[PDB]
Amino acid sequence: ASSPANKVYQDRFESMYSKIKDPANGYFSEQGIPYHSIETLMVEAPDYGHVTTSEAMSYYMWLEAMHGRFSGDFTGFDKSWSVTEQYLIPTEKDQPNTSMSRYDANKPATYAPEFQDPSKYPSPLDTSQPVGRDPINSQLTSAYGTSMLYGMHWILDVDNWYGFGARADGTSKPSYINTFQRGEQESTWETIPQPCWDEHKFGGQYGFLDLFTKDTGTPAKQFKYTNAPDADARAVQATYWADQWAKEQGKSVSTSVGKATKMGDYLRYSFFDKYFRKIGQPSQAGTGYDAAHYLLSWYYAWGGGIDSTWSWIIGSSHNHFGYQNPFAAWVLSTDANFKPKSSNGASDWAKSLDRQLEFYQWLQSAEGAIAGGATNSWNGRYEAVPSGTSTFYGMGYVENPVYADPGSNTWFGMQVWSMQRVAELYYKTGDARAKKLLDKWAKWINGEIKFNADGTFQIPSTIDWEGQPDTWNPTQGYTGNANLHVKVVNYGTDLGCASSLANTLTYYAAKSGDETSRQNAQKLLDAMWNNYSDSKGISTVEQRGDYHRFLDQEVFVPAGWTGKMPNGDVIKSGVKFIDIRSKYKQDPEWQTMVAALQAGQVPTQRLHRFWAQSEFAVANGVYAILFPD
Ligand SMILES: [Ca+2]
Ligand SMILES: [Mg+2]
């Protein structure tokens, strides 16, 4: 039998759950897939509101798990996994085993440099540059009997708004697409949306392939998918809780546990350097596990031929603290119900758990906030790490890993999303490393929360950094990083971040007994419920400072390259963001947004992001369970 939960906050979860699942609110497509946001005029990570991400799917799982805890019904949770497997994990038709089975573990892929400006692409493939060996592929094929990978592709065109369709048919939905391809300076506004399955039917002469990679001969028809490790790790985290809550009620989600465990087994590909180069000695090809940094890197990707048999797989050299998940690592390495079928699955995750906690501590600033991360590929070309640059196991410190437009660690959100997982670990195991991290971080954040007399509040929004951490010495440990400082540039009322913060403070308070954290967590939840509730969940008016880029952001296209988007939009040098997305002009909010820009004003919006609504719902549920009285 489940333990008693705080009635007030449980009702708040149930109310939010009803608003999110309400057919009249439009959070989901006809196929049952959650959108990034209800509103369509939306540009953040995705460049259209009805395009979805693996992040959203993992939040959908978390939401349904919590619903199972209070209702006793877990069919909704099992359904979230069914939708995930059907639409976000490439099927046998999307990643033909005929090509995947030709994968060569001794030559995983062909090296191509990364550049600091989109105008430097396409990047030339170089078969003469070293590439290490993949030590886990044999483990996976042996355990699962297939060469296909079981992981979520990160972004999906849910209602086929771009027109690529499924496997080049241009009419089916949902449609697998990808955007980011050209380095740290390619913002969401500077991409050229492309299909994952490229048969050269759309775009240019050879599809969109020669916009990104330059090969010796003619570009072959091929497919390619890209994973978002933090999303897959959250799916494991959510499934663990679903399993625990189901068992407390004599229920079972066995089938879903198996899927999560398999996903976690494949997620290990994010532990490796992009081209399997040795960690700390980037110029040398790895011989196996010496190319594993054991952290959840920015991605792992794979692809292969469509009309010819061949395939490749790559990990990632760039690591961001915001993507780590010590809780998922603990689950996969210690819980017997979640033990990966592969020979080294559980043991690799054990090593990752320890490495991840070292990573967090190394990045903890003098104040308490966690800094960016590190990379094993300086400038994305394995260049020499400048002297004086601090390192972590040979990897150079990087203030804003992977992206600089805007800086990947200038958003407060990464702080709460990641520390929330550390709080769950600390609550479950009382781990000393986790406690030390949280004690300092919590003291920092509790001093940055501002409550107004009218019931509204503010928390850090944009942050900046100065200095770097001291080089990591595993035997020395935390030095305090007196020369690493965080600075809060401005405050805001981001309801998604506030909910994640409340969640984090609740788990921490529950275990540590810190009253300051508990009352702040409750005050945030109450303030949002009482002052920001609407018929669709919660929301507030926010300024969209980058929306001017809709009209004035030029998109780079190589000289002489021309093509067309499915709707006829011409792609050629000189086009702006809007020129290759002309359907945006038919959006109900278009005229309003354009009017604002024409008057020299910053557009404003009231947005209902799926992850934010779910985050708030879950935070209420977590408080109800940990503080029943
Ligand atoms: Ca840029
Ligand atoms: Mg990613």
From Swiss-Prot:
The keyword Membrane does not apply. Residues 113-136 are annotated as: Disordered. The lineage of its organism: Bacteria, Bacillati, Bacillota, Clostridia, Eubacteriales. Residues 125-136 have a biased composition (Polar residues). Belongs to the glycosyl hydrolase 48 (cellulase L) family. Probable endoglucanase involved in the degradation of cellulose or related beta-glucans. It catalyses: Endohydrolysis of (1->4)-beta-D-glucosidic linkages in cellulose, lichenin and cereal beta-D-glucans. Keywords: Carbohydrate metabolism, Cellulose degradation, Glycosidase, Hydrolase, Polysaccharide degradation, Signal. GO terms for molecular function: cellulase activity. GO terms for biological process: cellulose catabolic process. InterPro entries: 6-hairpin_glycosidase_sf, 6hp_glycosidase-like_sf, Dockerin_1_rpt, Dockerin_dom, Dockerin_dom_sf, Endo-1-4-beta-glucanase_dom2, Endoglucanase_F_dom3, Glyco_hydro_48F. It comes from Ruminiclostridium cellulolyticum (strain ATCC 35319 / DSM 5812 / JCM 6584 / H10). Its EC number is 3.2.1.4. This is Endoglucanase F.
